[PDB]
Structures are given as structure tokens and as C-alpha cells.
Amino acid sequence: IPEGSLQFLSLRASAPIGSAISRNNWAVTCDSAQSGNECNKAIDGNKDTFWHTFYGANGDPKPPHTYTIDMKTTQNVNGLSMLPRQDGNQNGWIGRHEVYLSSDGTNWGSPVASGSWFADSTTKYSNFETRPARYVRLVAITEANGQPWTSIAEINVFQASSYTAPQPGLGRWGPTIDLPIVPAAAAIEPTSGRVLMWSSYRNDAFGGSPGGITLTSSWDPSTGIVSDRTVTVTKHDMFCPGISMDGNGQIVVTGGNDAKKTSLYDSSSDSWIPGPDMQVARGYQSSATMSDGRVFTIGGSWSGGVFEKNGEVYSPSSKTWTSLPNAKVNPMLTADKQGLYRSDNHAWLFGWKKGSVFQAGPSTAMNWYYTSGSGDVKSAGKRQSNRGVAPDAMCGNAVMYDAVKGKILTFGGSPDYQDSDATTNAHIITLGEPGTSPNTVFASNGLYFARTFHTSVVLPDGSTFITGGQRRGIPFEDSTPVFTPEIYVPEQDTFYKQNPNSIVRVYHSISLLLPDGRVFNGGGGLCGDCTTNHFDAQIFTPNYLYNSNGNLATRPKITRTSTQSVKVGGRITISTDSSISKASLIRYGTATHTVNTDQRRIPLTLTNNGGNSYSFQVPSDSGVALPGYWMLFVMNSAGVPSVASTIRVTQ
């Protein structure tokens, strides 16, 4: 008996890592309950009985509706589950919701989790960081269909095996954002400032695949609202696509199950529209935006035949894909045990000067790709250090934290895509002109924790946040998880462990830098009726946003910008509320399968005009300052960043 049905495009939701707390001694209360649908009906163990708020003769009071639990004793709570009514009737199904924890039952504080649950009969979960509590409260903000009622067939609360208070100075995890989909792919859509999330659909528990369906949702940081899941017949089964945000700011998704399809996200109408078909079938490949705004892609797993997966280029202006057969994929293949099926997967691509694209790995061999004529490829040497040659690092990460100096930090990964041990390998690559072999050195003493399928983002201050993953790569399995994130600080050539989280983020997980300076980490799974589909995300707040007291630090503010669009080499003048010491530009990102070829950081050279007025010039080379949308951050002497000001860079 699987969860849900094909009719609803259902998937089993992942539970927290813990056990259900005995409810025999619980005292429950609700804002209202119809006779016959008492509040204790949600804790009687009968899936066919449910609590239901007032209706009919008692009137139809609208939400919010609340369910409060007194567990009588303190427990280390890390989640809750909600089983909706199972009679086919949808009245009362909870949509938008919030979860609160309390030690006294009177001070509930702020929600430990909030978001929106999908409208179907499957068991829903709200998983969050462990916290001692005697009382738990679930608030239904809206009903799945906008109706006045709230109902619950069974509600449970989970306890972790232990609790350890977070250490001061190492950041903080929370809250959890509950979603109606597994965010397997995501991006920060620049025109709206929202986190766009999407996934494909498949569930062998039902069989008979629908075909070409894309499920999408979004989270707005300014309102905290998670939009309802949308089902689009894109005729593009993604699952393992390439993703880029072009020079104009449009999200371009390529290949996957439907190997030659291209889908574009039209931001003005919040919808996926068809793009031109690629010339070659590809899956698990990376794509990268170029200095001229075009998008380059190479690799594509294996296909029944003898068609090579050499490079090709997309033009947003002519809406065409053109093969670049001489931009050969062979030089970048790893020695994966599975051969061509995996050897060209997830290349560490970076658009660079004069239409070139640098490939930093995962293969030991690094290469330069060219896009003039029918393409070209030139060796850039091997990723290495005084410690030796770096081994193939499939699903390791690569982040360009200082584009002006050509700095790329690489870390983690394993020799084979699956069933192999990850390593602590980490390197710093310093890019020069196309065609030259960059110098490479080891980053500090490597990662604290070996990991693969982990994700990462460059932060406003130039540091790189690294999170999730597992010690041994096993897609869809939440084994050997790494719960402690790490931050690399370049000026100190040092890695720092941060406070750990409670949710496993492995294969199919993502991370993105939010405009407000925090990190959005979520997803993982997408395996039908499996127990590892994570329908959520969590926020990580870096230490730079907290003062010594534990409260939010005062942030510098950008009170004015002379323009919001500038050509490469151009100048922008700004005004701040107080003196600042540094500034940076971070390109908006996209993410899936550990790949993010869109993010990068440019340290800005400031000019002090006095009176808290500063100006800066955007790098003249579009290979460094890739066209598209960027986030402008200013930092004070204490290292605290402002929230981002959106800037569009053009040619």
C-alpha cells in the first residue's frame, strides 16, 4: 500500500530521524471541534477518525485553526506528522501552516517550521532542529482548497536520540520551510527575488509514467509564503538536467530523461515555456553561461548508438543550439567504473574570457574549451598540489569565490559516481588567460569531513559555505550522512566547522545564497514511494549576522544606487547609512546535482567620495563579470553585510 495515488502525482514524504512519542498521557486542545469529530480523534490511533473544526449548525469559522499538545514531560522534539482525513473528502486538508514548540505552554516564540503541504491524502511531515519541549502546537493558516475548515485524522510528534545546544559563534540552523514538492532543482529568480524550485515526476509504485511533467513551487523570503504546487506539461522529463541563467537572466534547463529538450522559465508569467531542442541528447551534464551571454554545454551520459557528447552552444537571441564538435569531451572524462554512462557527468564549468569555458574537474585533468568556429579544447594541466595529483572527484564542488583574481575552490567528491568513498581533498586553482595552465595548491589541510553529493555557495565576504553530503555515495540512500557544515575563509586559508543540522541532504539536494545573506539548503531524494524524499528546506544564518549577545547584528544599509543596470566596465555610485569597508558582487545562482555554474563573486574596488557616498567600477572583461543579474553587498568593519541590492550587468 503506497502513499497517495498517480491521479495526484503523489510521493511518500520523508519522516524525521527519530521515534514517535507515546500519546497515551497527552492532553490536547483545539480552537473548536464538531460533535463526533472531537480533538482527541486526532490521537486515537484510528486512521478513519478525525478532528474537524466547527461546521454546519455551529457555523463555519475560518482559519487560523490550532491544535495544541501537552506531552506532560519534556522531550527532545525534532518533528511532527499529520495524516489527513482518508475518506476521499478533502474538507479540512491543511495547506499553509506553522509549528511552534514551548517549554511552558505560554511562550511559543517564533515558528520552528512553516510552509505549505501539498493537497493529497499522504502523510505530511514538518521536520526541524531538535529542541527540548513539553508543548507542541500546529497552526493551520489555510485549507488546501481555501475552505474555512481544518481536520486531522492522526497527529504524531517525534523525538531525537539526543539534544546538543548550538555553540555560540558557529551560525544557526532554522526555521524549516515545508514544501509541496521535493526541491531537486532550484534558483533565485532575480526579477521576483523568490526561490524557485522544481522537480520531475516518477513513481514505480503506480507504474505507467504520465510523461513530460514538471512540478514547481516557490518561497518568497519577504512574505514567507510557499506557493501551491503547479503541474506543467513541459514534455520535458528532467530528473538530471543542466541549468544556466543566461546573460539576460532567464533560466535555461537542458536534457535529462527527454535528452534533447530545452525549457525556459518565463519570469513575467511564472511559467515554463519551450526552448529549442539541443543537437545532442544529454543527461547529467553541466551547462555554463558565457562571456557573450550564450550558454555552453558538454557531456551527456551515454546513449544507444555512437553519438559523441562533445560541446554545443545556445543563443538566447536566435533561439538556436549549434554543435561544436571540435570542443571534444574526451579530455575531461573521469576513469569511472561505469564508463561513458558516468565519466562526463557534472563538469565543473566556468564561463571565462573571450567565449572560453574552464573545466576544473571532476576529472584530474583540467581543460580549456573554446566556442569560436566549430570549437576547440586545450589541456590546462592536472589538478594537484605538493601532496600529489588530485584523484577524480565526481560530485565534488567547485566555487569561484574571487573572479577578479581567478580563484576557484574545489572540494570533496569520490572517484566513482556511486558506491565509492568520498575524500577530504580540497584545492585552490588560480585562473589566468585562456590556454594557460593555472597554478593549483591544496586548501589548508582539506575538509574536516569527507563528503560527496554536498552543496555549497560563496557568501558576501568571500567565504564558502559547504553543507550536507555523505561519506559514501549511494543515490537515494540517506546513509553515512555528514551533518556538520564547513566554511572556508580564504584570507586565513582555513576551514571552520559550523553548528550541525538534523536533516540529511544528499543526492538531489541543493543550496543557494539568498538576497538577505542567509543560505537556503533543501531537497534530497525523488524516488517515488521511497522513505527519503525530503519535502523541505532549512535556513542557515551565518555568524556574520549575529552579535556576541546572540541577537541579530546591526547591518549596513544601501540607501541609494545611481542605477540598477550597468555595462561591463561601467560605474555605479551608492549611498550608505554608515561607513563601509568592503563591497562585493555575487551573481545569482541555480543549482542541482551539486552543480552551480551561475554563482561567482567579484570583490569591488571602492572609491570614497565622502559623506558615505561610494562608487565602484564593474570589471571590464565580461568573462569575469558574466552578464546577467548580480547581488550587491556592502560590509562594515565588523564584517557584517547589508542585504543585497539587485544589479543587472550587460555588455
Ligand X SMILES: OC[C@H]1O[C@H](O)[C@H](O)[C@@H](O)[C@@H]1O
Using CB under 5 A as the criterion, which residues of the chain lie in contact with Ca ion when the complex forms? Answer: 41, 44, 46, 49, 153-154, 192, 267, 270
Shortest distance in whole angstroms from residue 540 CB to ligand X: 11
Residue 448 sits in the site that holds ligand X (CB under 6 A): no
CA distance 145 to 535: 20
CA distance 245 to 268: 15
Amino acid making up residue 243:
I
Residue 494 touches which member of Ca ion, ligand X, none, C-beta under 5-8 Å by kind: none
User: Buried (b) or exposed (e) across 495-531, using 16+ Cβ within 10 A?
Assistant: bbebbbbbbbbbbbbbbbbbbbbbbbbbbbbbbbbbe
Residue 147 touches which member of Ca ion, ligand X, none, C-beta under 5-8 Å by kind: none
Which lies closer to ligand X via its Cβ, residue 85 or residue 172? 172
CB atoms within 10 A of CB 619: 18
In terms of phi and psi (left: phi > 0; alpha: psi -120 to 50; beta: otherwise), the region of 123 is beta
The grid coordinates of residue 71 equal: 506531552
Shortest distance in whole angstroms from residue 33 CB to Ca ion: 13
Residue 170 touches which member of Ca ion, ligand X, none, C-beta under 5-8 Å by kind: ligand X
Shortest distance in whole angstroms from residue 544 CB to ligand X: 7
Shortest distance in whole angstroms from residue 542 CB to ligand X: 7
Residue 192 touches which member of Ca ion, ligand X, none, C-beta under 5-8 Å by kind: Ca ion
Residue 100 falls in the annotated catalytic set: no
Q: What is the DSSP string of 105-170?
A: SS---S-SEEEE--SSSS-EEEEEEEEEEEEEEEEE-SBTTS-S--EESEEEEEE-S---PPPTTS
Whether residue 64 has a cis bond before it, omega within 30° of 0: yes
Shortest distance in whole angstroms from residue 155 CB to Ca ion: 9
Residue 285 touches which member of Ca ion, ligand X, none, C-beta under 5-8 Å by kind: none
Q: In what order do the strands lie in the sheet with 571-576?
A: 558-561, 571-576, 613-617, 606-610
Shortest distance in whole angstroms from residue 71 CB to Ca ion: 18
Which lies closer to ligand X via its Cβ, residue 350 or residue 465? 465
Which lies closer to ligand X via its Cβ, residue 543 or residue 575? 543
Long-range contacts of 103-107 (CB under 8 A, 24+ apart): 103/74, 103/132, 103/133, 103/134, 103/135, 104/134, 104/135, 105/68, 105/70, 105/134, 105/135
Shortest distance in whole angstroms from residue 216 CB to ligand X: 34
Which lies closer to ligand X via its Cβ, residue 142 or residue 636? 636
**Furthest C-alpha separation in the chain:** 80
CA distance 581 to 578: 10
Which lies closer to ligand X via its Cβ, residue 129 or residue 344? 129
DSSP state letter for 276 = P
Shortest distance in whole angstroms from residue 312 CB to ligand X: 40
Which lies closer to ligand X via its Cβ, residue 242 or residue 468? 468
Residue 196 sits in the site that holds ligand X (CB under 6 A): no
Which lies closer to ligand X via its Cβ, residue 9 or residue 640? 640
Residue 496 sits in the site that holds ligand X (CB under 6 A): yes
CA distance 308 to 329: 8
CA distance 54 to 284: 51
CA distance 572 to 625: 14
CA distance 229 to 144: 11
Catalytic option among 507, 544, 546, 629: 507
Q: What SS3 state is found at 248? A: coil
Name which of residues 154 to 173 contact ligand X (CB under 6 A).
169-170
Query: How do beta strands 113-116 and 172-178 pair?
Result: parallel
Residue 496 touches which member of ligand X, Ca ion, none, C-beta under 5-8 Å by kind: ligand X
Distance of CA 107 to the CA centre of its chain: 32
- Of 69, 243, 349, 487, the residue at the interface with ligand X (CB under 6 A) is 487
DSSP state letter for 40 = G
Residue 267 touches which member of ligand X, Ca ion, none, C-beta under 5-8 Å by kind: Ca ion
Q: How many residues at the interface with ligand X, by CB under 6 A?
A: 6
CA distance 449 to 413: 11
Which lies closer to ligand X via its Cβ, residue 20 or residue 170? 170
Residue 211 touches which member of Ca ion, ligand X, none, C-beta under 5-8 Å by kind: none
Amino acid making up residue 99:
V
CA distance 228 to 217: 6
E strand or H helix that includes residue 251: strand 251-254
Shortest distance in whole angstroms from residue 644 CB to Ca ion: 18
Site string for ligand X, 541-570 (x = CB under 6 A): --x---------------------------
Which lies closer to Ca ion via its Cβ, residue 9 or residue 155? 155
Which lies closer to ligand X via its Cβ, residue 201 or residue 401? 401
DSSP state letter for 94 = B
Shortest distance in whole angstroms from residue 138 CB to ligand X: 33
- Catalytic residue set: 507
Which residues are at the interface with ligand X (CB under 6 A)? 169-170, 487, 489, 496, 543
